Ligand binder design. Sequence first.
Ligand SMILES: *[C@@H]1O[C@H](CO)[C@@H](O[C@@H]2O[C@H](CO)[C@@H](O[C@@H]3O[C@H](CO)[C@@H](O)[C@H](O[C@H]4O[C@H](CO)[C@@H](O)[C@H](O)[C@@H]4O)[C@@H]3O)[C@H](O)[C@H]2NC(C)=O)[C@H](O)[C@H]1NC(C)=O
Lengths: 116, 195, 108
Amino acid sequence: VQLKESGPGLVAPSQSLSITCTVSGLSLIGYGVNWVRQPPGKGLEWLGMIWGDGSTDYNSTLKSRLSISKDNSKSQIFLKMNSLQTIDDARYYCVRDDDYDGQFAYWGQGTLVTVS
Amino acid sequence: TNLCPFGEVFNATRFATVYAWNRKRISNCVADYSVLYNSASFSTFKCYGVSPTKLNDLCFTNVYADSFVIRGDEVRQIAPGQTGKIADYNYKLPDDFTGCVIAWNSNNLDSKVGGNYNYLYRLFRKSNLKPFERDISTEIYQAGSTPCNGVEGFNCYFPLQSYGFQPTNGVGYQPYRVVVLSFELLHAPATVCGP
Amino acid sequence: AVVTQESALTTSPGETVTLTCRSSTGAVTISNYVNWVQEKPDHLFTGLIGATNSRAPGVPARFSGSLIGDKAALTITGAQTEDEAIYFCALWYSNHWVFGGGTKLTVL
Ligand SMILES: *[C@@H]1O[C@H](CO)[C@@H](O[C@@H]2O[C@H](CO)[C@@H](O[C@@H]3O[C@H](CO)[C@@H](O)[C@H](O[C@H]4O[C@H](CO)[C@@H](O)[C@H](O)[C@@H]4O)[C@@H]3O)[C@H](O)[C@H]2NC(C)=O)[C@H](O)[C@H]1NC(C)=O
């Protein structure tokens, strides 16, 4: 199982952000996908969550801006952000779970997003 | 007409634990799956082989009813040819399985404030699990090179763990009542038939 | 919610080390569903333990986790020269996952 995502990299402040995460040799179906980001020089930072059935559970302080959607047929996960802040720069991962009651198992390489 | 006691299965007061699933024998009765399909009270309804639309005019010999309650995300591990902790250590289905699996959300029945230390599941097994096999042994599983001597310690773990059901859990981490029906035809005359 | 971990521990190959994860909101229970992940150079991540004890079949048997008192802990038996990493504990509190500060592990 491999996970790949594409990020714009450099975006102007107060502009939309769109990150897509792809899956290889696997299927979404009933597997959750978590979005986790990490600013440079700091620890991890939870962003959101999507379940297998389509229900979502966002970060409390970012529910106004965040939005998560996914496509079963095309096998991709989408993350959308609005009104970006200068602090909102970090490495963005899409995390998958396996079938042994263990979440946060399969990760991605990580895309780097800077705002200036 | 001696209707098959499906009501005492779906609407039973309590269901069985994951590792110790209860098996019920259904025979010498008449069933009606059209009401079951059109009820639309089940979150999950998928199966292969026989079709729900044409299941009414089909005669079998023995029908098996199985009960167990697991979390939301584990419902996909009750599919034919699937591998997981449940399908390896708790409940395995054969590749050539026939029948259907029913699952519906049950937060309002098995979730208690402060946790529900009533439901358990098998954690480790020495080897894999044969299809349609049940294990009740509580012997301390060994994952090392030293005998456990029946006492918990280093590399000596209890094979069973209790769930932490609570009404504040997530969507996929909520109790799910699952019943699976097995249909078998033998060389004996068929007894279980439709309306 | 605030969770804390040890800054760093020193370890030699051969013996066992226990890494804990303490939550300041109260005593950790089974319902917290503590998960552990691993950090490797070049920003490589890997999950180890789910449901506080559900080890994956591909993860080596030296990794084991359980609950001790009011803090969830991870136990490594027979550390190797390939076990240097940073470990994060994820807890299910309220309705959002909470990550820890990380624990750097060094092997001598
Ligand atoms: C939902 O999104 C929000 C928005 O970012 C996110 O909040 C962030 O939480 C982190 C974690 O606490 C905050 O980072 C802190 O920043 C302050 C400076 O403002 C630092 O002083 C803090 O450092 C302390 O803790 C460290 C250990 O972690 C110590 O090493 C250090 O010495 C300090 O004692 C800490 O790093 C961050 O500021 C906020 N962001 C905002 C905008 O407030 C939140 O975490 C997300 N939700 C979840 C569940 O993660």
